Amino acid sequence: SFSGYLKLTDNVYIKNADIVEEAKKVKPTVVVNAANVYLKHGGGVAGALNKATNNAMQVESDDYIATNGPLKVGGSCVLSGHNLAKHCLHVVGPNVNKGEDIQLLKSAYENFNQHEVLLAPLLSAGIFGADPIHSLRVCVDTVRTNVYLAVFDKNLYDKLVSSFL
Numbered sequence: 147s148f149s150g151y152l153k154l155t156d157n158v159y160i161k162n163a164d165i166v167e168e169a170k171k172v173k174p175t176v177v178v179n180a181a182n183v184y185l186k187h188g189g190g191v192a193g194a195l196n197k198a199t200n201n202a203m204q205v206e207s208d209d210y211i212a213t214n215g216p217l218k219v220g221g222s223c224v225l226s227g228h229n230l231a232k233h234c235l236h237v238v239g240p241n242v243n244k245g246e247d248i249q250l251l252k253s254a255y256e257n258f259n260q261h262e263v264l265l266a267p268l269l270s271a272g273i274f275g276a277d278p279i280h281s282l283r284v285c286v287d288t289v290r291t292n293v294y295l296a297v298f299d300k301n302l303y304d305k306l307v308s309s310f311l
């Protein structure tokens with residue numbers, strides 16, 4: 147199963163790891179993608195996960211959007227996990243850089259509660275522009291299911307662990 151994770155709370159775990167490599171190794175039931183409303187997996191975690199699927203995630207996502215329209219900020223959809231996981235839970239955290247509402251981060255993390263265990267990134271962190279310390283706090287205070295957070299950046303991982311209340 148998941149290895150080398152530091153236990154933050156009863157249900158939240160964290161590791162300095164590339165979520166793509168964690169997914170290829172563990173093959174979890176659910177890998178969370180840091181999606182946007184259009185499921186356009188260009189960069190950040192989404193670009194990395196999509197590149198690992200050889201663009202199959204993007205092809206599937208475009209068909210999903212053609213049928214259903216865009217997701218809501220704070221919303222999610224379950225699609226295939228391709229070669230990475232059984233499922234991919236595409237969750238849209240607010241992108242502060244695109245001027246979206248940071249109050250929607252709690253709604254975004256609530257999607258994780260529909261799955262007993264997930265491999266996930268820190269929502270709205272990185273190129274989404276939110277404070278990762280705040281994202282981890284919202285995660286621990288919102289998610290009740292077992293979440294294994296893979297934080298790519300070593301310096302951020304150390305900062306998150308050392309400042310965790």
Ligand SMILES: NC(=O)c1c[nH]c(C2CC2)n1
Nearest residue numbers: 164165190191194272298
């Ligand atoms: N942006 C990220 O959080 C992230 C995680 N994994 C990767 C892969 C190296 C491309 N990027």
Ligand SMILES: [Cl-]
Nearest residue numbers: 190191272273
């Ligand atoms: Cl990012």
